[PDB]
Ligand binder design. Structure first.
Ligand code: A5V
Ligand code: A5V
Ligand code: PLM
Ligand code: PLM
Ligand code: FE2
Ligand code: FE2
Lengths: 510, 510
């Protein structure tokens, strides 16, 4: 949990417009940037929160900004450019908001505002949001290269900002299809050297709980042998979605509603046999944005999730007007919100009818349960890994390249305090022990893990976070480096301009 | 959690018959019994596990045995007598099992085998089970005084072994009524000096979820202003219950079944206005035996519970044949059992219709939620206070006289390890910090708290536990005294005879 209040309101700098740079700045280092750290931290976020006098209303509406911190020989640079999306270009052209963003209707056509994340396919990098348009970008110059419409290649209406990436370069993702949820597989770059998006395909299909209302889906789970998809009670109302939008005046946020009765339905597919498994896993209601990690232990899937306890859409609390309130008002607003909680679900693969009425989760080191009912539903209870009052462990990351889809011990995350990011956390998922890094009036981003080249252990490396530190006595922002073992500060690299909120990113080694 | 295995099988001495004494033994003390500790530890449990060659099958079938440890001027005695119940007396008379116990049918009339607990009414003490018969006993001589039939006074078919006791002597309890659940209030001893059981009355009534199937109920919650009752999916099947028993040949265990779909319904009544409150609090399925404590915080009830995750009846795992298995087999048997978990529920008293869809639990220091649905059900999620794999924090106790029904910080309990009691625990319910006391091949009982008489602090006292320590190098058993602050050992008082399992009790000051 946080041990800090924010009466000064410095967090408002997260949602304040900034200018791009025309070339890299030097970041002034204190401490020692590790000498083995060679590459680029690439991150996406909104950078422009109004077009002249027309404002963006929601956290996910600001125009995409691509950020880069470079590391070489203990020296650091910072660079950023706006992504030349249709939404951005046409807004600069017409000096107004032209494309409807997530929660901002444009007055007189799907947004490609790639503000959420960046990821590799083949030798290319794509910035993304959650729509059908992803944007190829140049990771060295931050120049915008091309828009790609995923509907040109595969049958999905959108895809998450959270594709899984196997070590050989294979990319998996999930998207709604107008009804089902499809898993797209993009293969690695082959000897022919043609673009792997051309070779995309749907490999498996998850069914929908309601024919005219699919669930919102933000991420999913992957293991060597299985795909896990969590169907929540936050639904997209297709009657409001497909009807004339600039007649009534609707945005994306206007089409969400909550199913009160369904709870959460969990779904598994066989990855290698490309087949849906018909096990009716069921639990109580929560919003889910981020899977932490998924793995196989004897005949059981371990599913670690950052949950929000309730069925109201957490995104209702992320309008900019609310996030820019004063600290007492921010806290008051979050009182009725769903409660964050890290939970471990355990999904049995072997269901024997003879065990009807009993707990199938026979593993020796969990309290998660799964109960086979007579109607063949499997009712799940979680093991809580972390719980603090309006203290979210969110934006989780692990040592992904060596432990994704595999037995693991450590997660890192951003700590939210009534939605305000004010700390960095590490969680031992076996023991439930936690570590915190926190300074007053300091607003960090998602921590990203980078392994030491000679690492023998899971947490032998550093985490990188972008921290916004307003209020004089400091420079406006800095790149923070923490030791992954205990979250003790290794270095920081200060820059002389403000940085807004960023969501997701990656480290690109070189 | 436990840090100990039990391959030697010493826990089998908990379920082995013993002889009563004709007068007190000295307990050999090591360490220093506190000089302010003056009174009697009184405890109940089964002492006779077969009548000749007819065996009792279930943990709750053995004939009631009343135990007493006396403390005066740093010196200790131990004494025990069988309770001369009908069941016991008639069994000694007829040299066979005459009355049907909980899970042992007698072959050719309700049991009064008072093996569970002992409690004060007026100037008297009553040993009890969960039936309509309670047994007045003499707390100094351990003589049986009389049988009391509660049906002679008030309209209930049984009452729990867990009445609440307000400081003025007022006694509340709950019982099934063949359909409703009635709260009985027995008033304190008055100036007229007549027996308070004659002044018993039903003050409030809780409804039933199913007309022909009432839930098993073991305990309930009480605050200055409210009564809380938790209706679980472990049901008593009245069609099997009332039909002729010694025709086919049924016991009590044969009449329990699990409702798969209802989950858990929670109920509040207004204590002082003697009125049921019509709030439909609902959650996922669990067995419940012990409430820890209940209290009021602003307009919310805090409900702390020792839960078992699942709907199968935990009592299915407590046949003596299973509990007497070898360690590897005991562990294997418990694998499919419900998982123990300490949970905090938070029940809002002010339900506004305007908050439909939202989390009503606006308190600042909990992660528990309560969600108002459109059908006016209030869906609850807990805050988990403690969770270990087949490690139950059970038989909870608090500093009851000063903190029962009130804001509190500390609970004590018996740690079960795949149902085997092998340690003593303290839980800070605000911070979730735990303390453990454990020695190899040592099988403790419920810890009972005793305040230093001049304590201002909640945990300024000691806990007392009866510990069975088989295997040579020690005497068969001992009374343990721990400091309540940190569970460090203060003294023990060894006795030269075995003691079987005991369930509940009290400290009687003098
Ligand atoms: N990061 C959360 C919001 C997301 O950036 C976003 C921004 C703008 C539009 C969106 O639409 C999601 C739908 C889902 C169904 C298919 C079409 C896209 C989603
Ligand atoms: N300690 C748990 C079991 C309890 O000792 C016990 C022992 C013997 C008979 C019982 O009967 C419970 C019924 C419930 C319905 C009303 C009558 C009593 C219950
Ligand atoms: C760095 C963000 C701080 C301000 C917003 C915090 C509220 C986040 C709620 C949980 C995560 C929701 C998903 C947002 C990230 C994403 O778009 O992928
Ligand atoms: C000292 C007891 C150890 C063996 C029994 C352990 C399983 C207990 C399950 C939860 C409590 C059930 C109620 C038993 C005490 C009672 O009858 O009130
Ligand atoms: Fe995300
Ligand atoms: Fe009990």
């Amino acid at each position: 949990s946080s041990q800090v209040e924010h009466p000064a309101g410095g967090y408002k700098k997260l949602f304040e417009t900034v200018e791009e740079l025309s070339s890299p700045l030097t970041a002034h280092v204190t401490g020692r940037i590790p000498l083995w750290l060679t590459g680029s931290l690439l991150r996406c976020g909104p950078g422009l929160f109004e077009v002249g006098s027309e404002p963006f209303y929601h956290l996910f509406d600001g125009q995409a900004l691509l950020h880069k911190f470079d590391f070489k020989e203990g020296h650091v640079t910072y660079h950023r450019r706006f992504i030349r999306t249709d939404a951005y270009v046409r807004a600069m052209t017409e000096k107004r908001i032209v494309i409807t963003e997530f929660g901002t209707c444009a007055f007189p056509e799907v947004t490609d505002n790639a503000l959420v994340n960046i990821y590799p396919v083949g030798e290319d990098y794509y910035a993304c949001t959650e729509t059908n348009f992803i944007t190829k970008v140049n990771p060295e110059t931050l120049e915008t290269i091309k828009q790609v419409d995923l509907c040109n290649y595969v049958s999905v209406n959108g895809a998450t900002a959270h594709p899984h990436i196997e070590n050989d370069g294979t990319v998996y993702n999930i998207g709604n299809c107008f009804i089902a949820y499809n898993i797209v597989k993009i293969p690695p770059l082959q000897a022919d050297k043609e673009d792997p998006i051309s070779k995309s395909e749907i490999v498996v299909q998850f069914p929908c709980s309601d024919r005219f209302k699919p669930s919102y889906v933000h991420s999913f789970g992957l293991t060597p042998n299985y795909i896990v998809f969590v169907e929540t009670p936050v639904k997209i109302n297709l009657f409001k979605f497909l009807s004339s939008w600039s007649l009534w005046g609707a945005n994306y946020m206007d089409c969400f509603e909550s199913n009160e009765t369904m709870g959460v339905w969990l779904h598994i597919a066989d990855k290698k046999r490309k087949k849906y498994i018909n096990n009716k896993y069921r639990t109580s209601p929560f919003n889910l944005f981020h899977h932490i990690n998924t793995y196989e232990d004897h005949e059981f899937l371990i599913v670690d999730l950052c949950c929000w306890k309730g069925f109201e859409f957490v995104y209702n609390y992320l309008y900019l007007a609310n996030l820019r309130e004063n600290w007492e008002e921010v806290k008051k607003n979050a009182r009725k919100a769903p409660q964050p909680e890290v939970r471990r679900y355990v999904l049995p693969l072997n269901i024997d009818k003879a065990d009807t009425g009993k707990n199938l989760v026979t593993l020796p080191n969990t309290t998660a349960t799964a109960i086979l009912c007579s109607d063949e539903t499997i009712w799940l209870e979680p093991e809580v890994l972390f719980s603090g009052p309006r203290q979210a462990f969110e934006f989780p990351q692990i040592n992904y390249q060596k432990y994704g889809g595999k037995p693991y011990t450590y997660a890192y995350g951003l700590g939210l305090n009534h939605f305000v990011p004010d700390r960095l956390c590490k969680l031992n998922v076996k023991t439930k022990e936690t570590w915190v890094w926190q300074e007053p009036d300091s607003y960090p981003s998602e921590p990203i893990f980078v392994s030491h080249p000679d690492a023998l252990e899971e947490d032998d490396g550093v985490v990188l976070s972008v921290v916004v530190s307003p209020g004089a006595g400091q420079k406006p922002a800095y790149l923070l480096i923490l030791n992954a073992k205990d979250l003790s500060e290794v270095a920081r690299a200060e820059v002389e301009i403000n940085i807004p909120v960023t969501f997701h990113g990656l480290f690109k080694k070189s």
